[PDB]
Amino acid sequence: PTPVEEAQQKTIEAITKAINYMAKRRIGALLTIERDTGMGDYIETGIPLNAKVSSELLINIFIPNTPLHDGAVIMKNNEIAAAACYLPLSESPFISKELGTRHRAAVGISEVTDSLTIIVSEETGGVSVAKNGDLHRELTEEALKEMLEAEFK
Amino acid sequence: PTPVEEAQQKTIEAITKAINYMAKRRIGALLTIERDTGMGDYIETGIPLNAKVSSELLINIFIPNTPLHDGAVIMKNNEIAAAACYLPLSESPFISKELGTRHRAAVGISEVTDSLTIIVSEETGGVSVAKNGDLHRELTEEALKEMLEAEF
Numbered sequence A: 001p002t003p004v005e006e007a008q009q010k011t012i013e014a015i016t017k018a019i020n021y022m023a024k025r026r027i028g029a030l031l032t033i034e035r036d037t038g039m040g041d042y043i044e045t046g047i048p049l050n051a052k053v054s055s056e057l058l059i060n061i062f063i064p065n066t067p068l069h070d071g072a073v074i075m076k077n078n079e080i081a082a083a084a085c086y087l088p089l090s091e092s093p094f095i096s097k098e099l100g101t102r103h104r105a106a107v108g109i110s111e112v113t114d115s116l117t118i119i120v121s122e123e124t125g126g127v128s129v130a131k132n133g134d135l136h137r138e139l140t141e142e143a144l145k146e147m148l149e150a151e152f153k
Numbered sequence B: 001p002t003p004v005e006e007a008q009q010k011t012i013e014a015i016t017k018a019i020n021y022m023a024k025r026r027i028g029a030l031l032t033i034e035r036d037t038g039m040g041d042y043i044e045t046g047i048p049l050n051a052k053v054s055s056e057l058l059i060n061i062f063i064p065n066t067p068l069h070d071g072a073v074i075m076k077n078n079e080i081a082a083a084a085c086y087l088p089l090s091e092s093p094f095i096s097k098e099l100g101t102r103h104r105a106a107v108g109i110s111e112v113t114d115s116l117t118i119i120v121s122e123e124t125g126g127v128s129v130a131k132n133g134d135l136h137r138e139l140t141e142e143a144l145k146e147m148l149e150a151e152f
């Protein structure tokens, strides 16, 4: 592997480890990975971090009833750009009706960007991904990893 | 004021807001501010963040029973360099016997650096500072802010 490839895999591993912990504890989480469409306008609504990715920091951000847990983490250029960011709520009538604003925010940003958003449900610990206006629900660890690898390829 | 001075004031405001929040809730915390003696050896023992300072991130770091809460946060200027860092434990006999490892780690790093370390006690909520081998306990909000402003 090359340095860039090793860094991308390290980030994927850090994300999957954090998602796994939050799924087990049913910690709600919203993590958007910026791609070609710039999301500076949304990054600026949150608390600036520009931090190195780690599973530890991702977990610490989303602990319930803490300053940073409300809103989205947005990643950009292999860093955590900001936390507690606003994302637009989808008005799509085709999202499962049992899901709340976290999933609607993920779908909403995916309607106006090429980003990939990961959601952990606080009700079930289920893991889903929003891209292109669609929500892919009930993902296994292997399925999330495949989506992250496809996105970065 | 220069941009450097304004940035320093924002970082002091972030630190004091976080310390005040944690003291009221008995959230133990250990926060070392690097000065002219470089702390790279200790930064490298923790989880790298290299993050912009905010009161929110400082609070989130120290929440009990989380990955980042055990060990020291080390700050470099206006960044949180790393969390969950090792610091050496002082053997000074002038550390109150009831105090635990966070206070002994703070005095310990203060004996081999010119850093300023802030400690929040999870037992009492008391705020203390270690500097040059001495621990100063039970600081008021005003006293802590004045110490930080004097440190910059």
Ligand SMILES: O=C1CCc2ccccc2N1
Residues within 6 Å of the ligand: A025, A026, A027, A063, A064, A065
């Ligand atoms: O209030 C709280 C604090 C801690 C926590 C951890 C994991 C899931 C839910 C909670 N709720």
Ligand SMILES: O=C1CCc2ccccc2N1
Residues within 6 Å of the ligand: A016, A019, A020, A023, A127, A139, A140, A141, A142, A143, A144, A145
């Ligand atoms: O992406 C992921 C992360 C790990 C995980 C654990 C348990 C159920 C589903 C998942 N999916």
Ligand SMILES: [Mg+2]
Residues within 6 Å of the ligand: B137, B138
């Ligand atoms: Mg006194």
